[PDB]
Scaffold this active site. Structure first.
Site, mmCIF file in Angstrom:
data_model
loop_
_atom_site.group_PDB
_atom_site.id
_atom_site.type_symbol
_atom_site.label_atom_id
_atom_site.label_comp_id
_atom_site.label_asym_id
_atom_site.label_seq_id
_atom_site.Cartn_x
_atom_site.Cartn_y
_atom_site.Cartn_z
ATOM 1 N N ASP A 342 -3.288 9.201 25.537
ATOM 2 C CA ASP A 342 -3.022 9.461 26.329
ATOM 3 C C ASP A 342 -1.057 8.040 26.442
ATOM 4 O O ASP A 342 -1.035 6.970 26.409
ATOM 5 C CB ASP A 342 -3.570 8.519 27.492
ATOM 6 C CG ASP A 342 -2.987 9.477 29.205
ATOM 7 O OD1 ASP A 342 -2.953 10.848 29.024
ATOM 8 O OD2 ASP A 342 -2.925 8.944 29.953
ATOM 9 N N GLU A 371 0.396 11.631 23.283
ATOM 10 C CA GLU A 371 1.397 12.487 24.755
ATOM 11 C C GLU A 371 2.898 11.207 23.766
ATOM 12 O O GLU A 371 2.873 10.352 24.695
ATOM 13 C CB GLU A 371 1.068 12.268 25.934
ATOM 14 C CG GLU A 371 0.051 12.951 26.298
ATOM 15 C CD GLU A 371 -0.151 13.144 28.156
ATOM 16 O OE1 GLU A 371 -0.241 12.226 28.212
ATOM 17 O OE2 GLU A 371 0.383 13.746 28.479
#
Ligand SMILES: [Ca+2]
Ligand code: NA
Ligand code: NA
EC number: 3.2.1.41
Length: 714
Positions: A342, A371
């Protein structure tokens, strides 16, 4: 200064509580260099509110504190297994209760009690031994159809969503929305053909009441729900209790999760864990352990914050090893097959590269992705190379999501819901081509394996809903439902035949929706009743859709919003369009796995083998258009071609003499089906004098097999 603290107290020894001697002893180590005293508070295994006793730790090397609890305790304990603990840390006359950052499990956690007392502000750790729990034969995946990153087909599922549909209660033998209930639906995924199942955060997270995890969240809600995606981290070694048969038994979640991973492996798939090291739910989680140390900070030492909590500073020695120790422990304990970071652009590249190396040393076939948005904050005045999309030209390890392909096919930030390539909005044909060959235009991918290709994920509107919003057509009209599905299949075929690593949001295969179908919300409501994180979807005349509210960020939404719909996914009598799309995705997956034409392993090989046929500006193809056509020469010499007509009219694709060889091809996908075997009577295609004509909203894949060709024309 964290840098000075590192020179003086950087500790590379073991941390955590290691349960020894079939439970008769526990060795404790905590790093807390600024502490005046540190004791362990032990809570009862049957009633975690009850303190059984407090035992002082003593100072060890490099700022640690240590103690052995054993036979000789006067706690009245002969087996420590399942007892709970927190550290009571004293500084400057002030005392805090802190969570062991290396806790291997936790007491049932209920954040609705967090204000009761200091002992309730953070979870209590449990003494457990993970090695002895779960299937003792658990090991790394032997993953079918998979050799290197470009061969992965990733499937993104949240553990609760995947079995929370009340329609399957009849068939479940385990408590819904748990790790062991997930096992019961794994055959569907094996049948879909995906290689890796990426789970939304399974590590402990903060805002939730795990004591209500068996309650059905059956009223529609999109805020203030006990449901949580899990992006509020509490601890990086312990699993949440939310997906356990019994959160109050700290060993059960570990055995159950081991069972889940082993069952994924038995079915020839692997597991990827979504991990959230970029921030914690609460600043005090780590500030209470060592002040002005663990987080990225302003120059004056103030902890910098993100998503309501502390940004973990992974350049700092003990934060670095937190991340690395966590990755290693999770790989070795649960035998997983990869990680999705993340907000991975928040971290220094060095940490993320070192995690990769460490993980691979344990599991040489492990993959990672993240990400890679450009989000780095770091320490004030300490610029650092970040593990973001611009890192891709410097490494061939961890891949990044490609927002360029998502935006160009079906919109994304900023501009969500604007018509794009599969949704009626003409796009630069070379930009579409480059994306399909894993050459996005917004960062440099010097390897197709750097690129995770996708159009939908857990965040933002689902592929079905974003198509419906974008083209502005209400799915409650049968003809619009059909059209949405045509466009969803076309988008899925683009991704599943693209170079790079395709990624599938759970439900994208069938056209999952997050429409807020609450009976009170059939038509627009008063502004103070509007569901949180919604968009109100309108037709071209600006009339609301029936049940116009759709949830675009379901992080805090009930099961009525978040369930995976098994009836739409599998019951082809009741939902023939959804099942036709599911089966279209299964066949597209089988198509990709049948040849490495769609998964070339180097940039140079893609340059040599993939050629654009629809040259923008020529033969009815505009510079920006809603069609594309290209060829691949596979490594075995077979010729594949992908043609997409996302226009609302029939379109012609010009072959001429250069591409005449495509005329005697087998058709592998058409408007109804996809797969690796030639389709007997292909639908939506018409051979013409200039080349090939596709019906409106139709895509195809062709194959010319060199083993059926002439001996003489050569
Ligand atoms: Ca929530
Ligand atoms: Na969206
Ligand atoms: Na979706």
């Amino acid at each position: 200064s964290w840098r000075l603290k590192d020179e003086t107290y950087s500790y590379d020894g073991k941390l955590g509580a290691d349960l020894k001697e079939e439970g008769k002893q526990v060795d404790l180590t905590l790093w807390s260099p600024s502490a005046d005293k540190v004791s362990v508070v032990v809570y009862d295994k049957n009633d975690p509110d009850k303190v059984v006793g407090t035992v002082a730790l003593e100072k060890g090397e490099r700022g640690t504190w240590k103690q052995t609890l054993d036979s000789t305790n006067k706690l009245g304990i002969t087996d420590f297994t399942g007892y709970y603990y927190q550290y009571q840390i004293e500084r400057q006359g002030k005392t805090v209760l802190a969570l062991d950052p290396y806790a291997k499990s936790l007491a049932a956690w209920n954040s609705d009690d967090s204000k009761i007392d200091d002992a309730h502000k953070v979870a209590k750790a449990a003494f457990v031994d993970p090695a002895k729990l779960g299937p003792q034969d658990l090991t790394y995946g032997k993953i079918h159809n998979f050799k290197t990153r470009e061969d992965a087909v990733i499937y993104e599922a949240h553990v609760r969503d995947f079995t929370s549909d009340p329609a399957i209660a009849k068939d479940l033998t385990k408590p819904f929305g748990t790790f062991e209930a997930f096992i019961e639906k794994l055959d569907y995924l094996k049948d879909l053909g995906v290689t890796h199942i990426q789970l939304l955060p399974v590590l402990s997270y903060y805002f939730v009441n795990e004591l209500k995890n068996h309650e059905r969240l059956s009223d529609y809600a999109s805020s203030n729900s006990n449901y949580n995606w899990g992006y509020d981290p509490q601890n990086y070694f312990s699993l949440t209790g939310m997906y356990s048969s019994d959160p109050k038994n700290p060993e059960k979640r570990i055995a159950e999760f081991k069972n889940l991973i082993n069952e994924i492996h038995k079915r020839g798939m692997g597991a990827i864990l979504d991990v959230v090291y970029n921030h914690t739910a609460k600043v005090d989680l780590f500030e209470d352990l060592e002040p002005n140390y663990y987080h990225f900070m302003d120059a004056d030492g103030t902890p910098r914050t993100s998503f309501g909590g502390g940004r973990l500073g992974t350049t700092h020695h003990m934060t670095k090893r937190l991340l690395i120790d966590s990755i290693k422990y999770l790989v070795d304990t649960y035998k997983v097959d990869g990680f999705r970071f993340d907000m991975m652009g928040d971290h220094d590249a060095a940490s993320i590269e070192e995690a990769y190396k460490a993980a691979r040393a344990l599991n040489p076939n492990l993959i990672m992705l993240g990400e890679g948005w450009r989000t780095y904050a770091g320490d004030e005045n300490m610029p650092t190379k970040a593990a973001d999309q611009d890192w891709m030209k410097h490494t061939d390890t961890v891949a990044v999501f490609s927002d360029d392909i998502r935006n160009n096919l079906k919109s994304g930030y900023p501009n969500e819901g604007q018509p794009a390539f599969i949704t009626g909005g003409k796009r630069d044909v070379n930009t579409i081509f480059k994306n399909l060959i894993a050459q996005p235009t917004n960062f440099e991918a010097d390897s197709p394996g750097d690129v995770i290709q996708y159009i939908a994920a857990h965040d933002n509107l689902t592929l079905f809903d974003i198509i419906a919003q974008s083209i502005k057509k209400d799915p409650s009209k049968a003809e619009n439902y059909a059209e949405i599905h045509r466009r969803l299949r076309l988008g899925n075929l683009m991704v599943l035949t693209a170079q790079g690593t395709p990624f599938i949001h759970s439900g994208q295969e069938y056209g999952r929706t997050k429409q807020f179908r609450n009976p009170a919300y059939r038509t627009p409501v008063a502004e103070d009743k509007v569901p949180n994180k919604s968009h109100l979807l309108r037709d071209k005349d600006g009339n609301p859709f029936d049940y116009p509210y759709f949830i675009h960020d379901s992080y805090d939404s009930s099961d009525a919003v978040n369930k995976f719909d098994w009836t739409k996914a599998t019951d082809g009598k009741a939902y023939p369009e959804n099942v036709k799309s599911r089966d279209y995705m299964k066949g597209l997956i089988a198509l990709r796995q049948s040849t490495d034409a769609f998964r070339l392993k180097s940039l140079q090989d893609i340059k040599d083998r993939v050629h654009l046929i629809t040259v923008p500006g020529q033969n009815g193809v505009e510079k920006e258009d809603v069609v594309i056509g290209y060829q691949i020469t596979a490594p075995n010499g077979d010729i594949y071609a992908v043609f997409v007509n996302a226009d609302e009219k029939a379109r012609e694709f010009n072959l001429g003499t250069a591409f005449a060889h495509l005329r005697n091809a087998e058709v592998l996908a058409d408007e109804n089906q996809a797969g690796p075997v030639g389709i007997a009577n292909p639908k939506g295609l018409e051979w013409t004098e200039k080349g090939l004509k596709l019906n409106a909203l139709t895509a195809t894949v062709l194959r010319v097999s060199q083993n059926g060709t002439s001996h003489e024309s050569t």
